[PDB]
Design an enzyme around this catalytic site. Sequence first.
Site, PDB file in Angstrom:
ATOM      1  N   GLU A 280       1.454   5.211   7.831  1.00 17.62           N
ATOM      2  CA  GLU A 280       2.838   5.496   7.485  1.00 17.62           C
ATOM      3  C   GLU A 280       3.494   6.483   8.459  1.00 17.62           C
ATOM      4  O   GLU A 280       4.649   6.304   8.848  1.00 17.62           O
ATOM      5  CB  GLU A 280       2.927   6.030   6.054  1.00 17.62           C
ATOM      6  CG  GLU A 280       2.454   5.039   4.997  1.00 17.62           C
ATOM      7  CD  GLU A 280       3.058   3.656   5.178  1.00 17.62           C
ATOM      8  OE1 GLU A 280       4.279   3.559   5.399  1.00 17.62           O
ATOM      9  OE2 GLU A 280       2.306   2.662   5.096  1.00 17.62           O
TER      10      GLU A 280
ATOM     11  N   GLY B 225       0.829  -1.191   0.000  1.00 11.60           N
ATOM     12  CA  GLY B 225       0.000   0.000   0.000  1.00 11.60           C
ATOM     13  C   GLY B 225       0.866   1.244   0.000  1.00 11.60           C
ATOM     14  O   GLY B 225       0.596   2.224  -0.711  1.00 11.60           O
ATOM     15  N   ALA B 226       1.916   1.188   0.812  1.00 14.50           N
ATOM     16  CA  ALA B 226       2.839   2.294   1.004  1.00 14.50           C
ATOM     17  C   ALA B 226       4.093   1.792   1.719  1.00 14.50           C
ATOM     18  O   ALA B 226       4.199   0.599   2.022  1.00 14.50           O
ATOM     19  CB  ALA B 226       2.170   3.407   1.798  1.00 14.50           C
ATOM     20  N   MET B 227       5.037   2.693   1.992  1.00 14.34           N
ATOM     21  CA  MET B 227       6.260   2.326   2.719  1.00 14.34           C
ATOM     22  C   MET B 227       6.832   3.508   3.492  1.00 14.34           C
ATOM     23  O   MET B 227       6.974   4.604   2.945  1.00 14.34           O
ATOM     24  CB  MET B 227       7.319   1.781   1.766  1.00 14.34           C
ATOM     25  CG  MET B 227       8.615   1.396   2.459  1.00 14.34           C
ATOM     26  SD  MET B 227       8.412   0.060   3.676  1.00 14.34           S
ATOM     27  CE  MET B 227       9.567   0.628   4.924  1.00 14.34           C
ATOM     28  N   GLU B 228       7.194   3.275   4.750  1.00 13.31           N
ATOM     29  CA  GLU B 228       7.460   4.370   5.684  1.00 13.31           C
ATOM     30  C   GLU B 228       8.870   4.975   5.648  1.00 13.31           C
ATOM     31  O   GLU B 228       9.349   5.456   6.680  1.00 13.31           O
ATOM     32  CB  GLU B 228       7.173   3.897   7.112  1.00 13.31           C
ATOM     33  CG  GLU B 228       8.147   2.850   7.661  1.00 13.31           C
ATOM     34  CD  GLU B 228       7.602   1.429   7.598  1.00 13.31           C
ATOM     35  OE1 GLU B 228       6.794   1.142   6.694  1.00 13.31           O
ATOM     36  OE2 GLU B 228       7.981   0.600   8.457  1.00 13.31           O
ATOM     37  N   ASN B 229       9.520   4.988   4.482  1.00 16.00           N
ATOM     38  CA  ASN B 229      10.905   5.476   4.399  1.00 16.00           C
ATOM     39  C   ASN B 229      11.087   6.841   5.083  1.00 16.00           C
ATOM     40  O   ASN B 229      10.354   7.791   4.808  1.00 16.00           O
ATOM     41  CB  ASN B 229      11.372   5.563   2.945  1.00 16.00           C
ATOM     42  CG  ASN B 229      10.946   4.362   2.116  1.00 16.00           C
ATOM     43  OD1 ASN B 229      11.385   3.234   2.352  1.00 16.00           O
ATOM     44  ND2 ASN B 229      10.088   4.605   1.138  1.00 16.00           N
TER      45      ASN B 229
ATOM     46  N   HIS C 173       4.497   4.981  11.764  1.00 11.71           N
ATOM     47  CA  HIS C 173       5.759   4.256  11.685  1.00 11.71           C
ATOM     48  C   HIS C 173       6.990   5.108  11.999  1.00 11.71           C
ATOM     49  O   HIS C 173       8.027   4.564  12.366  1.00 11.71           O
ATOM     50  CB  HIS C 173       5.942   3.662  10.285  1.00 11.71           C
ATOM     51  CG  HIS C 173       5.363   2.284  10.106  1.00 11.71           C
ATOM     52  ND1 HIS C 173       5.557   1.275  11.015  1.00 11.71           N
ATOM     53  CD2 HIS C 173       4.653   1.752   9.085  1.00 11.71           C
ATOM     54  CE1 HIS C 173       4.963   0.172  10.577  1.00 11.71           C
ATOM     55  NE2 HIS C 173       4.404   0.435   9.415  1.00 11.71           N
TER      56      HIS C 173
ATOM     57  N   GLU D 264       4.429  -3.207  13.106  1.00  9.72           N
ATOM     58  CA  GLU D 264       3.197  -3.201  12.322  1.00  9.72           C
ATOM     59  C   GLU D 264       1.897  -3.253  13.124  1.00  9.72           C
ATOM     60  O   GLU D 264       0.877  -2.714  12.683  1.00  9.72           O
ATOM     61  CB  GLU D 264       3.215  -4.367  11.329  1.00  9.72           C
ATOM     62  CG  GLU D 264       4.365  -4.298  10.332  1.00  9.72           C
ATOM     63  CD  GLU D 264       4.299  -3.078   9.435  1.00  9.72           C
ATOM     64  OE1 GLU D 264       3.229  -2.431   9.375  1.00  9.72           O
ATOM     65  OE2 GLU D 264       5.325  -2.758   8.798  1.00  9.72           O
TER      66      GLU D 264
END
Lengths: 898, 900
Positions: free
Chosen positions: B321, B284-288, B324, B343
């Site tokens: 996100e 869905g997304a990524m918390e970079n 996180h 998570e």
Amino acid sequence: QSKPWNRYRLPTTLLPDSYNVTLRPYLTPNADGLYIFKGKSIVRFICQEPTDVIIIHSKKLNYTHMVVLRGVGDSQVPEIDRTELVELTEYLVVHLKGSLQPGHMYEMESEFQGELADDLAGFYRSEYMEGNVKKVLATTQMQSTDARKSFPCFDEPAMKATFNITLIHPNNLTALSNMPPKGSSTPLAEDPNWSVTEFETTPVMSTYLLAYIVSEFQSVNETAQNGVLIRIWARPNAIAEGHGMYALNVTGPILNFFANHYNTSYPLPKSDQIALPDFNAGAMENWGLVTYRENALLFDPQSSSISNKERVVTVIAHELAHQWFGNLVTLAWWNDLWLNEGFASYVEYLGADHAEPTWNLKDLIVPGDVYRVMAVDALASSHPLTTPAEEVNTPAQISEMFDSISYSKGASVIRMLSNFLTEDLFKEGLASYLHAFAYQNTTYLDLWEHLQKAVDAQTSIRLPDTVRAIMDRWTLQMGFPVITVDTKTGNISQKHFLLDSESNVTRSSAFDYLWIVPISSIKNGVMQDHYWLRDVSQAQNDLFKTASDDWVLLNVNVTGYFQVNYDEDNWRMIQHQLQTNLSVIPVINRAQVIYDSFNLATAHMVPVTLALDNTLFLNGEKEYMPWQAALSSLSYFSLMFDRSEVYGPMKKYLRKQVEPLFQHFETLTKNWTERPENLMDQYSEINAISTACSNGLPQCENLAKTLFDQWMSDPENNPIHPNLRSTIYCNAIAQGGQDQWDFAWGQLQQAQLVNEADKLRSALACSNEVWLLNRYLGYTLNPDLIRKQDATSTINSIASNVIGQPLAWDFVQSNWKKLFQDYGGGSFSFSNLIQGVTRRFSSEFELQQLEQFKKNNMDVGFGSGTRALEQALEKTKANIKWVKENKEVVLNWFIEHS
Amino acid sequence: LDQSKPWNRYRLPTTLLPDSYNVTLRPYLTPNADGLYIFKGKSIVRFICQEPTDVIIIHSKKLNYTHMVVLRGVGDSQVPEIDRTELVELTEYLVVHLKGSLQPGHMYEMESEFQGELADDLAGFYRSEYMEGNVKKVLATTQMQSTDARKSFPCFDEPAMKATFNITLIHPNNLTALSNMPPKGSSTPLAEDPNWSVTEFETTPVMSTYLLAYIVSEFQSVNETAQNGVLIRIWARPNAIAEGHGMYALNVTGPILNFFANHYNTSYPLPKSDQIALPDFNAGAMENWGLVTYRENALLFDPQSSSISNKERVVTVIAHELAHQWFGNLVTLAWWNDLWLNEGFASYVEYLGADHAEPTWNLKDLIVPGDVYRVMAVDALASSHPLTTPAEEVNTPAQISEMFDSISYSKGASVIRMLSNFLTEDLFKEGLASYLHAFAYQNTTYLDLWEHLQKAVDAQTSIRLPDTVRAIMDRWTLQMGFPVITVDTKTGNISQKHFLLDSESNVTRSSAFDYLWIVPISSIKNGVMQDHYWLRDVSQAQNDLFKTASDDWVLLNVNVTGYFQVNYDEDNWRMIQHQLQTNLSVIPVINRAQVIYDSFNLATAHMVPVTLALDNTLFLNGEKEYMPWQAALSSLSYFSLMFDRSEVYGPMKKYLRKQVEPLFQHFETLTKNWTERPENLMDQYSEINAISTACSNGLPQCENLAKTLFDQWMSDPENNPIHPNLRSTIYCNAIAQGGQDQWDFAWGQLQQAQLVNEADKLRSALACSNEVWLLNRYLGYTLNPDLIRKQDATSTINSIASNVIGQPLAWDFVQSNWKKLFQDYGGGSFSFSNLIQGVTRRFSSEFELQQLEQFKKNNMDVGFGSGTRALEQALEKTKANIKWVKENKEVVLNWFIEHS
Ligand SMILES: *[C@@H]1O[C@H](CO)[C@@H](O[C@@H]2O[C@H](CO)[C@@H](O[C@H]3O[C@H](CO[C@H]4O[C@H](CO)[C@H](O)[C@@H](O[C@H]5O[C@H](CO)[C@H](O)[C@@H](O)[C@@H]5O)[C@@H]4O)[C@@H](O)[C@H](O[C@H]4O[C@H](CO)[C@H](O)[C@@H](O)[C@@H]4O)[C@H]3O)[C@H](O)[C@H]2NC(C)=O)[C@H](O)[C@H]1NC(C)=O
Ligand SMILES: *[C@@H]1O[C@H](CO)[C@@H](O[C@@H]2O[C@H](CO)[C@@H](O)[C@H](O)[C@H]2NC(C)=O)[C@H](O)[C@H]1NC(C)=O
Ligand SMILES: *[C@@H]1O[C@H](CO)[C@@H](O[C@@H]2O[C@H](CO)[C@@H](O)[C@H](O)[C@H]2NC(C)=O)[C@H](O)[C@H]1NC(C)=O
Ligand SMILES: *[C@@H]1O[C@H](CO)[C@@H](O)[C@H](O)[C@H]1NC(C)=O
Ligand SMILES: *[C@@H]1O[C@H](CO)[C@@H](O)[C@H](O)[C@H]1NC(C)=O
Ligand SMILES: *[C@@H]1O[C@H](CO)[C@@H](O)[C@H](O)[C@H]1NC(C)=O
Ligand SMILES: *[C@@H]1O[C@H](CO)[C@@H](O)[C@H](O)[C@H]1NC(C)=O
Ligand SMILES: *[C@@H]1O[C@H](CO)[C@@H](O)[C@H](O)[C@H]1NC(C)=O
Ligand SMILES: *[C@@H]1O[C@H](CO)[C@@H](O)[C@H](O)[C@H]1NC(C)=O
Ligand SMILES: *[C@@H]1O[C@H](CO)[C@@H](O)[C@H](O)[C@H]1NC(C)=O
Ligand SMILES: [Zn+2]
Ligand SMILES: [Zn+2]
């Protein structure tokens, strides 16, 4: 394997002379819910060679030592050591303490008991409703090897004998058998509620032709022109309603026709025809007592279709043909089955045409048999008409011999034979054959000898070689040639027709897959001199060489069992003729052009565009057979493509081509109220309506909807002509929902005419809802809802539905044990099931699933569907290649022409 | 292979630890002669030697080296000669064999140069593509989690081995370069070629390799400085930004970040937080950290064309996100076996952040249908797993990828909500603040969490617990599953047992806690709250709180705060039913849903008669609120999977038509003939479900509605008359009723779609065709990247499989294309597992089980990678389905017939 009782063929040491058989069916179940019959038999046999063991067939019989052995006159009788049953080879084995003497006769007595099962084999039970009363009757089916299932006998066709049958039955039931009753019935001494009926001695005949029936049936009758008493038996209600009338119209005159045509009398005082509610095949030719499916004998002028009517006369004609070809003269062994079935399948056309001369039904052999069997005979896994006697050994192998090769290729090859001899000369030869081998047995060589005798006594007909040289090549090797012509040079060549370059032919041919071929031809619409292609791969003749504005076609009316390909230019001239004036080409050859080009395309011998191009003229075609050819050919396309992107454009093309024919049939029939006059035109209408609705023509969908709506509003007054019902019912159920389905299901369960039930069963498979189709499949294994005789055909119908395909394939796999035990030893049904559910397979994944299915069930095996499975595997491999190589061109062609 | 060699083990040695990285990357956004897109890189890693070792083992995956390493010392360091370097592909290692050992306490610098493919595989440094007018655009972007950092440059690629990163991008001079941190100064022309530029970024914070990100593209942005001084930017395709599709994200992002900062009393330490929407993206997304990446359907929003569900997705994914940044980035799991620390927390506090941005929604309640009962279906299996698995069980990359599942996300969120609920969120967040402050820029295990929560509890008096935090939470964390709580209301007897499906359920995972829990039990009697109760770690107890008079009823687990299910004696069930019939308002709406959820779940596991569950749906006739209907729809979804190919299906649809018709009619009236949506979110959701249910079960009024509107749209495609909330249903039902005309029209709309929300609805609706040839042709398209993006391939296949006619098509399709499916997704989070689950959901026969077993056997050579547990769960569930269907089909059929 050194012990005789472990081998499938009987010893030649003993030969039967005559049988006494008394049977007593119990038409009510015992405490264990079993219907049983009890029996006692005495066989008299002669010892030909010294032996200390009596081997006789016995199947599913319980013995109540198991036998008593006595001598005739002089015979010295050895003591019985022991008796045992060997179930695999289906034997009753009597070990003796000393040898029987040669030249001497013995009598062996047995008492036994078996189940009156619903398995349609041996002595079995059949059931129906009359009002609110369940009725049970007792009836027989011995062919091929189930006489042994009713009493112990030397159960092989060549081992003929006379039979003295006695039936012990309830005193208010009718007892029927091959022969008339001997005197009157008498009360059973122990219990006068039963009666004892002895029948006159049978002629010398095979075990598989025995029959005996105990029922409440009624009859109509007439004495035929040759003095033979004809009776039509059926359920009391069917007789009262007049459903036996048509059979009575045709049976006698057809019997009398054959007797005259083959100059050979029917030697029995009567020929009973009887319709059974439960029956495996279409009918059975038991000598003096011919048994039938109800849909093969009964007929309702107001509710049955012209197709139903045609089935009745041809099946009757087929069964009556057997009285000569099968009964009087019998195959020596099952490897020569076409001597029986090939002839009956050909001669039935002769008989049926005599009863219905206006139909021109003789022409139906081309779509019905010739091109029917060529689909399978193109395989490496086919088999010749006459197989090596040692290849046909087990009961399963014998059963599987009853296939399209033995029936349809047999009829096709025999028609070709008749055509180049003339029927006049052919029937003289056959008369000689019949007279010489009456009450005996034959092989294919005996047939040739009497045909040759006729040719030699005779000066008008001439052959390029002996009858044997010519006919051995059509009989002893499988398959057929494609005849290829270069019309620029008149070069003509022949080669074995095969599907693949992958096709691995392992059956070796002593004739090198070369044939001697009779070749008729027509040029610019005018018949040419006949020609004989000799057993060579290539030849030349100016008959087949054309000027640039001429055209030729070979095999006029497709009398010869082969297919024809031309050079591209001659194909183009044919195409131009079909556009300009299709009347110049004989109607059957218009069909041929479509049949052959599609078949050639299937084997990638011509571009697919050729076959498709040959359907363009159908726009203005009114006649039955060329349209039938296109439908049959494109049926393969549907199987290959109706789950792909090709399907949409394909249907669009078919809508476009058939609409003018539909409109033609809308006007001449006066809004579908008046049927076309002759048979072909009625067949033409049926196909046009079917095709229009199948391919989604809006006019047809609305017609089907309106009619079926009208019926549901007034169920007792069906507004749909019988000819149209199969299409109207199917399309309305497909368009509709559960209301339509449940309505038709109600009609089915109350049906009182099998023809109508048959149409309802097929139409119910047309639902577009998965849950209804799966629920329907569940019913097929429930005898209260779907008779065992109809289970597999119903499953096949559902599989024909694109949505039903995975449901049925899954269903067949999941229920295999029951399906194998019920049908896996029988003829037709089991083989047709396997062929039916695997027809569509055209991918590597589908092939792997078929192979896995095979591996999973190898230990038990596939019985009388063993060759069917092998052909299924070969054909799927070929389909994989054809779809891959053809898909793109086919898709584009449909798009461009729709 | 030889397990005595460290390069043959999946876990890195602890002998060497990274300090900092320099990484320079250069993406080539045009293919070479072979048609390959590539990137080139150079990196130097500085690490310290903790313990003497003569081998350097570092992660490396699908990289080509141009020995392969140069090793240098920092100041004093004794530098061993390199003997040789090798690549060990199975364990994804670059291995440097040395002559003698590295010197403990001293640092070293190791330099490499390398090349890799910019593939369309959505992992590591990869490429993404889109059209702009008639020009094909290509951009470079990243996805490192779980362990594809190694796919972009050699690194010590384990989450606890944190370091700082100096990123440099070399890129075309007219494209924008983004990374975690802001640029350091200006870009400078590349010396050899001024057509390229060089952008150096500021040093990252101390962080894990999986949080790295760098992107090169033509994208544009909108921006705003948040209340906490942090720059927020929303990045997307120039046309999407120009049409204002980034505005909703800009509206909510900053406020949510500031809210979390305050809620947990811990500031966000970075100068900026970029959010960027990509055309090709796996999850869905990524918390970079500093550069949060998103699917376009997770960040962009069109107020005229997106639905309220689309809106809820955007704000909750953003909140997830941003959550996180604290739970994952600042404080990180020690190893992947404790994934829920990342998570579970993000999946819970996402509700808090989204509720802050949209307080009128009451969206916090959505945790019950969204997470609690979602995960229970799988946590009822013997083949489930606990939140914290033994470290030794999570070893390979496939196993790590597999942990990213409904347990770690949804059970995690559920258990944390339960925790928050019995501590109160005020007390909870105080313990969490202590936790974050203590472990900032470091790593933690579940035990570190209990210690800080306990400290908060001990420093107060008002909130009481029956045992330590650890005693309670270890039991929810270290053993799988959940209890069914059974009460006999005649005696007050209360009992617990591990909830399992069958009597043949074979639990082989032993529990040090004997599958007993310490359970917080709220209750309500005749609508009024009772005193709270804790069931201790005992199989049975008794309390008069649960003993009723014959005139009264009780319900346990108010609002389903606790992660468990409840069964009652038959008489209490009857009293609940009578209440629901007489006055449903007396029962809290979430508990009306609970009654349905729990009774159906118990029925599935043969714990109650099926008739109880079905009888508990009878009141829905007069129910207008979202969640009780959602419970029924989710529950009967299982019935549909089991029965939609059987004689049960007809009567089932008939009953559902009957039940949903008044609700359909209610909304027809309320919405003024469908022209005005309901005001609040819950009622909007209720309308959507009412419409979906009516059409799917063949209610003629709904069927007429869908055909009419779709006919109207086709007559004027540029003016879509269907409100976004209703499109999923209307599209589907019109396609189903229709033929090729409708299908080809929708396909055309899909391939010209400029909004992913709309494309998503079209894709799902196209799977509703009732024509095999159309569905099969559609399946063929799903593995063609020109027609269906790789990111959407498996979801599309799943949509087709959901169609009862598409079920055998997709099952065959998946089997016949398995080789490609495995190498594309088998490594491989979310998509692969979902695909196996989706296509096998319906299996309920011995034949289907045999076929699934054979499938397993056929592909055992390669194995099933990140779908291994999913396959074991599929097999277990199929076996349970066979038994349930056999024993239930008669009662179910008769019930539906009688009540319809
Ligand atoms: C199903 O059960 C529910 C209870 O769970 C039944 O609902 C109750 O019905 C009562 C009878 O009408 C009603 O009565 C009386 O209410 C008001 C005072 O109400 C206000 O304060 C109380 C307490 O704070 C309420 O909780 C509160 O809530 C509700 O109403 C609000 C709207 O105004 C809320 O917006 C809404 O969400 C919520 O439902 C409310 O604000 C008194 O004025 C009333 O007196 C008057 O009626 C009397 C006659 O009975 C009196 O004799 C007259 O002089 C005077 O005109 C008082 O009697 C309850 O408020 C109501 N409870 C709830 C929680 O709604 C419901 O009827 C039942 N369904 C069926 C079919 O039986
Ligand atoms: C069945 O009945 C027939 C007719 O009676 C028997 O045939 C006779 O057999 C005897 C003994 O061999 C012959 O001598 C007669 O010539 C036959 N009578 C005829 C032909 O009319 C036959 O034997 C019986 N079958 C048995 C007893 O098995
Ligand atoms: C990346 O850049 C940072 C910041 O410039 C470097 O950090 C410096 O490292 C030196 C040497 O260890 C320290 O003494 C300084 O205190 C650091 N400066 C800071 C923190 O501002 C880091 O060394 C670089 N990473 C490398 C070279 O791998
Ligand atoms: C068989 O039946 C006939 C006629 O009844 C009888 O004459 C004969 O003896 C029987 N055969 C035997 C007993 O072998
Ligand atoms: C035959 O014998 C077997 C074994 O005794 C029995 O199962 C079967 O029912 C019998 N069949 C009869 C008596 O028809
Ligand atoms: C088969 O028929 C031939 C005559 O064609 C005959 O000689 C032979 O005896 C018959 N076989 C048997 C078993 O009667
Ligand atoms: C077409 O050919 C037939 C010969 O079969 C002929 O009778 C007919 O007249 C021809 N058509 C035309 C238009 O001349
Ligand atoms: C990493 O990059 C920085 C900035 O260019 C530089 O000062 C440092 O020397 C580099 N580290 C190396 C070369 O090991
Ligand atoms: C890496 O090297 C291998 C081996 O030749 C090659 O197949 C692959 O294309 C290379 N990858 C690159 C250069 O990105
Ligand atoms: C992980 O965190 C702990 C403190 O919770 C710390 O002591 C340890 O050094 C960290 N591990 C690594 C590899 O940095
Ligand atoms: Zn026959
Ligand atoms: Zn997350």
